[PDB]
């Protein structure tokens, strides 16, 4: 029940706000998280218009495959938070030692507004290979977007606004150009008394 293709598994993912009260005191609020503690399928035709669609778009990448590399995560985000650092962290494992590139596309009404690319290298770990993005800064667009949601009069408006906010993450083997993982993220405001939640789906044609 994981975000895992033939060659790569995303073990952890989180986006957070860390507040430094003093040099020895930090408070961290997780907005969304996977990995802190069969998958249903979603028809890709049902979400195509919420992601970039043209050459290199979600549909185009999905058609190139492999199809077992494509996932849709629905996050119920915990927006209940009160010297600030907005960051993202993620961890991946593979049986192979590869040079990988993670591309993150922030989208508004299915159009790309930001593209962030990071090259990641492997560390040997217990017979396998580990890849990690540790505390990468959230882009200014994202920070502004979080601020905007909080200053909306109602949470009914938050869900309608969040319906047109999506993220597409593409992880590629830099040397073979193979799609190792592709995760499409959709959002809603959480109403859980147990914090942020998620549903992970396999994307199918």
């Amino acid at each position: 029940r994981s975000v895992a293709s033939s060659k790569l598994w995303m073990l952890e993912f989180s986006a957070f706000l860390e507040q430094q009260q003093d040099p020895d005191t930090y408070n961290k609020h997780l907005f969304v998280h996977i990995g802190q503690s069969y998958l249903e399928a979603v028809d890709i035709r049902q979400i195509y218009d919420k992601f970039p669609e043209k050459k290199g778009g979600l549909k185009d990448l999905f058609e190139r495959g492999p199809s077992n590399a494509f996932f849709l995560v629905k996050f119920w985000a915990d927006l209940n938070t009160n010297s600030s650092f907005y960051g993202v962290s993620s961890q991946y494992e593979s049986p192979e030692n590869m040079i990988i590139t993670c591309s993150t596309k922030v989208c508004s009404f299915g159009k790309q507004v930001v593209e962030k690319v990071e090259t990641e290298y492997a560390r040997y770990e217990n017979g396998h290979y580990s890849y990690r993005i540790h505390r990468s800064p959230l882009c200014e667009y994202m920070i502004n977007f979080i601020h905007k949601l909080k200053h909306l009069p109602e949470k009914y408006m938050m869900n309608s606004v969040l319906e047109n906010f999506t993220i597409l993450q593409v992880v590629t083997n830099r040397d073979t150009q193979e799609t190792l993982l592709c995760i499409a993220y959709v959002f809603e405001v959480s109403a859980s008394e147990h914090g942020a939640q998620h549903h992970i789906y396999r994307l199918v044609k």
Binding site: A41, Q46, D49, E163, E188, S192, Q197, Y201
Partner: peptide
């Protein structure tokens, strides 16, 4: 099209 009227699993609207 609003997400609510799309061909999606029942779980899509059921926060864990």
């Amino acid at each position: 099209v609003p997400m609510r009227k799309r061909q999606l699993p029942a779980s899509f609207w059921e926060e864990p």
